[PDB]
Amino acid sequence: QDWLTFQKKHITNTRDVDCDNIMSTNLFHCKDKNTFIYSRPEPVKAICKGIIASKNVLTTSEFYLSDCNVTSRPCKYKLKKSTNKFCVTCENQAPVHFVGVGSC
Amino acid sequence: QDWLTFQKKHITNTRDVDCDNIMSTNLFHCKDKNTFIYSRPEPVKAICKGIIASKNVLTTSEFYLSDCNVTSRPCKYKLKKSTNKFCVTCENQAPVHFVGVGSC
Numbered sequence A, B: 001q002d003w004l005t006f007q008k009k010h011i012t013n014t015r016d017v018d019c020d021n022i023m024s025t026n027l028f029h030c031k032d033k034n035t036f037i038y039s040r041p042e043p044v045k046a047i048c049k050g051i052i053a054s055k056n057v058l059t060t061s062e063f064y065l066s067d068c069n070v071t072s073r074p075c076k077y078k079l080k081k082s083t084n085k086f087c088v089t090c091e092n093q094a095p096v097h098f099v100g101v102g103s104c
Helices: A003-010 A041-046 B003-010 B041-046
Strands: A033-038 A055-058 A063-070 A077-084 A086-091 A094-101 B033-037 B055-058 B063-070 B077-084 B086-091 B094-101
Touching (some): A041 A094, A041 B003, B033 B094, B041 B094
Antiparallel strands (some): A055 A086, B055 B086
8 A cells, every 4th residue: 555565565675674573573572682694595504514513603704684682662672783793503504593693 | 493493583585485474463464365575675666666647567577476375274374486577556656556476
């Protein structure tokens, strides 16, 4: 019925994560914090290429990150946008856990 | 705990729309079908450039489409991925309705 509503209904992609709306979904259930990587999966998965054992691996390059951080208002967030290295648990050559931004 | 959950929780430029998470939110309210355009808003907006009067317009060019379809289980979805032209209602140079895939 309008452009912004069409966008929300039918367009899957913005670097600008809508924190209040995505953090309130079933998957995030209003938790205090989540980091989103604006990237294709393949370059993220490549971080763990050739790693079989469970290991924490910092990226050798930076990615575009959206951090949703809760305010004093329940399930209301502020968005921080940055580029940085991040750390993942690699297992069977795939990321299984996001460990942290800038450092393991 | 695994690469699929990692993707759902932290990767934000995917063609794999998380149907089960998104289709339950207020805008979709567990409806049986929704088509998502794997794109940023600008090239989608551009379809309706200089189209003023309410008008159904098929794209002259293909986009990546991710169709969430309900399974035999209510508000549980399969994802069908394709490239195709699609049809929109344009008004005031913005798409306001998704009319269908491949045809108006």
